[PDB]
Amino acid sequence: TLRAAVFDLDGVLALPAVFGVLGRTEEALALPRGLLNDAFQKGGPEGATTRLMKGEITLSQWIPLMEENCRKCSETAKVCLPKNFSIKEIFDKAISARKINRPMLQAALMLRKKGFTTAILTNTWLDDRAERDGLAQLMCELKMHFDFLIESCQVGMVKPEPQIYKFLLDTLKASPSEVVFLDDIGANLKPARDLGMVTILVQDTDTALKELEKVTGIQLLNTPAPLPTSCNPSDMSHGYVTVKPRVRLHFVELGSGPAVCLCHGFPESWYSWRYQIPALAQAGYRVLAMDMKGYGESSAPPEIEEYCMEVLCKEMVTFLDKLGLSQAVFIGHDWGGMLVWYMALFYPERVRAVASLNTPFIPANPNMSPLESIKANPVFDYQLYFQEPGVAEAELEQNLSRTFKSLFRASDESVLSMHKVCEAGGLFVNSPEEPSLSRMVTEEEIQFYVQQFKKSGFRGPLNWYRNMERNWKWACKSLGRKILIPALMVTAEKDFVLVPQMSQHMEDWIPHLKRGHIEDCGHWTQMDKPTEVNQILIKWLDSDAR
Ligand code: NA
């Protein structure tokens, strides 16, 4: 019968509770027990703290009223507050120390995944302190995971008044017996129990989650490690820049801080970074996840030479110029990784730092045609199949769902071997018509790629492979250079085309190179091991890109 879960903020979704600082301050200063808690609740429904929680006044206006209450309580107790006593300092530290209670958030996310409507209901204030950004960030991270956020200072009602509970039920569109309500303050839980709500008094998180699990019948404790947060395309900010007549690049943008430009490979999308975008934004970066030229909402001109590396790099420089960005960190995967190494070699002044997933940096050999180098490696046979215009386009466009379901597979799920493709007659000739769904992707995720590729198909994307000679002549101009800006190379153990061993000589040309390595990871690094990718990238960005 339960179909809604409501959580308090202080002491439930975030710990240590700010309210607990009154007791901790009394004990540290050896003040009479309850002195600061009595000053905080002084006047009850008519006192300063209720006015603050209803939004009548702001936190900075309340701070001197709380201080006056502290003195009235200390005078009646016959005691004295310390010389440097500061309510602002006490509250600044408590708010800063209070972090998200990750197991409680994990449980709310699980209930929402199982069809529950979730909400945060909190008695809170209008924070106008100089340090208010810290709590604004915490609220942004939390609220995105809930259907509703109800704050006392916005609605002009406070717990435990009956009106805020009726407002909550109207918001949830639910009868009280269909709601579980979690709170750490017994008095604020009482009105919800009177209406008939299932209530949980939260002291330690583990016991609260055992009660929640028992009453909902859903496993919440001891669960497998969840995936990082993903992106819902319709919830993102979409940006568009014209880099030349007829050529417009699309990107998704999230976060504040140093600009980080994510460059996908073939045949992908900005959406290939769906697990990285929220994580990097939360870590303090302004993420720009591109639809590379030829893909998604970016322009896809038909000419092969529009996709040579020199042109593609010049366009990424123009993209930064139009956005007013002097630099960005460039992170690439597959063809995007090849692009970011050439951005580092030709435009180091515009690249704050560079990172590649899977694609190594191997200098061009000026004594061998790129055609002969490609012919020498059996795993690169699919590149020769992609050379003749129209052949691979017809195969890849014939059934888009089959194409993405065949390509996007973990290392132990393959249906396509990248060798003997020309002799076989195509990539999918020994592959099923209706491939099974990989554990890495849902049907809904495959359908997003299908819809993106309906616009321009595979001509633009395949043209990235049709400039081997042009790219080789341009790369040969850089053979006397080294990459001396901050760089990271991430290898994937089970990518059988871009094998880790191919990156072994990179330090000869990038002497200060940093590395990451992902075990049991295939070609589709970002979606195969997203937790590991996020950990490696954030660690590297925080040490080398700030
Ligand atoms: Na072949």
UniProtKB/Swiss-Prot annotation:
SUPFAM superfamilies, A to Z: alpha/beta-Hydrolases (SSF53474), HAD-like (SSF56784)
Residues that, per the record, bind substrate: 382
Phosphoserine modified-residue sites: 369
InterPro entries according to UniProt: AB_hydrolase_1, AB_hydrolase_fold, Epox_hydrolase-like, HAD-like_sf, HAD-SF_hydro_IA, HAD-SF_ppase_IA/epoxid_hydro_N, HAD_sf, PGP-like_dom2
Effect on the protein upon substituting residue 286 to Q: No effect on phosphatase activity; decreased epoxyde hydrolase activity
UniProt xrefs under Pfam families: Abhydrolase_1 (PF00561), Hydrolase (PF00702)
Compartments, as annotated in UniProt: Cytoplasm; Peroxisome
The EC number(s) this enzyme carries: 3.3.2.10, 3.1.3.76
The keyword Acetylation appears for this protein: yes
GO CC annotation, single: cytosol
Protein origin, superkingdom: Eukaryota
NCBIfam families: HAD-1A3-hyp (TIGR02247), HAD-SF-IA-v3 (TIGR01509)
Name of the protein described by the UniProt record: Bifunctional epoxide hydrolase 2
Organism lineage: Eukaryota, Metazoa, Chordata, Craniata, Vertebrata
